[PDB]
């Protein structure tokens, strides 16, 4: 493996020559040397994107769609490679990476499918002889900055859709997941997109990302990452007046009412709260249970969590949980655990950590002052709070700074709709996991969870703009100068 | 003169007042609040409290409220006209226009309130219904300019209200009385307390509070590009969304196949109406060489006819004053810079008090301040060009993206130019400032972020909520043993 940037149709070394050694979060073994890019690399890619822009944006939608279809067929051949890399570099299990690769395939196809169909409007004019219509135009070069947790699918959801609608792209993957980025670039290359239409530069955020965010020729930034970093990017984007899409994380309520199949509720709870070691923006990070089922629920949930198998994700396809992405995550989780213990929480199970591995720590007897109720816990530490009624459930659910997703388990149509209605989130799910995601549906939060929506036409929307154009067919008198005649 | 907060008119908490004066004769118009952070915070908390009640009711009830606002506005028309003239310096034709348009705006918000639709989606999963709902953003700050303070304020306010948001509104300091009249209208319409709030104070204090505050979900702003940039940056802190209208230097491109006389009348109206203080004003006129001489001749000929006077004098007055002495000073700089760079002054150049005559220039180039900057005032460059590519090159060479226009009878040239000009809006054979109440009004580049009017306003102030219901039980991948 020789991992490189990809700029203007060419796999290229960083101008610096710098390299970081990317190692596996699993055993710490070396994975590959990867670029450590600077501001000049970013600048090169940006200019490549700005020169490719006109040619790319002015061909008909169908041509771009043919490119995305080509991308799809290339990706299908690269599936196993993507999976291996997602497991080795990202710590994903077989099931996590299979799921992500499938979803990625779907995403690419989706952008392809929608490319020809993104429509403007024909309007009624309040004026006499006037054609009034509204066109969709692509924004420009779009910066795309992505996280390490689902680096493939998140990256591709932004890239594929942004490309489809006539934007070009410069893409900086997460520092912990460079090889995934590189592989995306291999796909785009093998698909033969025109040079400069898609550019990959692997480098540290404060350098590469900073340039992408401040550059004059960058039209838009779409960013999935930490909420603070997103506030930074948001503020710095204001200088050049570039728009932004920001997915800043969540702390999603999973609310289980008293009429549920409690065993089923526990199975669901375990999947939604702990999948990918809980590193999912839509993870069910706060579990809220009705007191009538609370004890039986807690006992069952813990029973199933106990069942989870944590191991090297390379071993076989049945491993439930691989490691956390890095040492920093384990440390942070240890902070959350320390906080909860010191605040009087019962640690029902887990907390054991070796290397980057962390066995899920479940807590009860928690209150709203716990760090794990007040912060997004991106990792395998879960509170379970007990509530007396639907109102309290809702109160606790909305008791966060986050807005992303949420879910309620119940068979009662009124309680389901009332809670759904009252929960403040960009997304809500009745009788499913908090992390439900489809390729074409608006995905995003309110509150501290972010700004904008992605997937399908919502992504098209983030990366295009309305252009109001009229044609006046008749001659008019004008109010000045009033002396006319 | 009365901030409006939580259903009542009241003093600012500082008690600090300020004298506001007519740009026309400089006479005293009213004493108005100088509000502080606390005033804003109070308006905001009131908006926030009123929010759940206002958002949750059916849209038809809000529409009803807007129809009441409509009825009241119709009663208050001459009050609004009067104030727009005396405090704003608008001529009778311009204030009549703004009022007629504001009426259409309120009616439009009311009309559309019941109609803003989410989507029903096809799901890729078995046994799941998947839909998307619209939801109001929250309390919304509305910060407006002095040039069209009524119609701009009301486009923002009415549409934001229609769709279930609460408003905290801080009018341009140069037009506080118009703000007050709006609050008067809202109060007489009887909207629930906290739904709409007016606080009159300085931008860096009241506006800063609005833009940095926790409970404000969104800010829609119309004003200086620099101020807009600041607001966009400070917005980041709380992750609040912004709509930003930052003005333009709109190209008006005149080709050689046009009726030249007509092209000139159009050009004069588009470039100079309301003393050229209009975001979509035709600020840079671009003529094809073949018609250029006769065009210039005729344009100047009509400019000659423009009556500047006390806009109170009568209904045929073409131009009133600028808004303040600062604008005169700036216009003076633009003219002096153009002359000093060897620009040929074809006509005008005199100022008195707040009045400034149209100053028209030719033989300019791209380094002139009147080509490089938004000239919000009656100073206009006319640039002669050899061909369409050059028309477009000059049209695009500017930081601004707002609007634009081309006069021509050739369909291909019209459409080539319309596509090539980088602007958020474009008009073939009409003025650059065409505006309808239901259209996506906004620019690109330095002209701003977002669109307003109709569903586009609703859009700036709402979000999509994806909701699913899953009807089948599922098997889960972890734990695998299970
Ligand atoms: O989830 P998680 O990935 O941890 O969330 P993060 O915010 O930590 O990561 C998200 C992305 O933002 C990048 N980043 C960090 N600082 C900046 C910046 N000033 N400008 C642009 N991008 C930046 C990161 O780059 P990187 O990963 O290289 O630090 C990463 O690609
Ligand atoms: O055109 P023109 O009206 O002259 O453009 P401006 O930007 O100067 O004015 C637009 C509006 O923004 C206000 N404003 C100025 N600074 C800020 C700020 N830091 N935060 C919030 N609002 C602000 C103005 O109030 P004000 O005029 O009172 O400063 C005005 O109401
Ligand atoms: Ni939008």
From TrEMBL, chain A:
A Pfam entry, by short name: Aldedh
Binding site for NADPH: 146, 148, 172, 175, 205, 210, 226, 229, 232
Recorded GO MF terms: nucleotide binding; oxidoreductase activity, acting on the aldehyde or oxo group of donors, NAD or NADP as acceptor
Binding site for NADP(+) 1: 146, 148, 172, 175, 205, 226, 229, 232, 247-248, 281, 376
Domain (Aldehyde dehydrogenase) ranges: 22-469
Binding residues for NADP(+) 2: 146, 148, 172, 175, 205, 226, 229, 232, 326, 329, 376
Name recorded for this polypeptide: Aldehyde dehydrogenase
Species the sequence originates in: Pyrobaculum ferrireducens
Automatic annotation (TrEMBL), chain B:
Positions in coiled-coil regions: none
GO molecular function, one term: nucleotide binding
Binding residue positions for NADPH: 144, 146, 170, 173, 203, 208, 224, 227, 230
Keyword rRNA-binding among UniProt keywords: no
Residues annotated to bind NADP(+) 2: 144, 146, 170, 173, 203, 224, 227, 230, 324, 327, 374
InterPro entries assigned: Ald_DH/histidinol_DH (IPR016161), Ald_DH_C (IPR016163), Ald_DH_N (IPR016162), Aldehyde_DH_dom (IPR015590)
Keywords linked to the UniProt accession: NAD, Nucleotide-binding, Oxidoreductase
Protein name, as recorded: Aldehyde dehydrogenase
Organism: Pyrobaculum ferrireducens
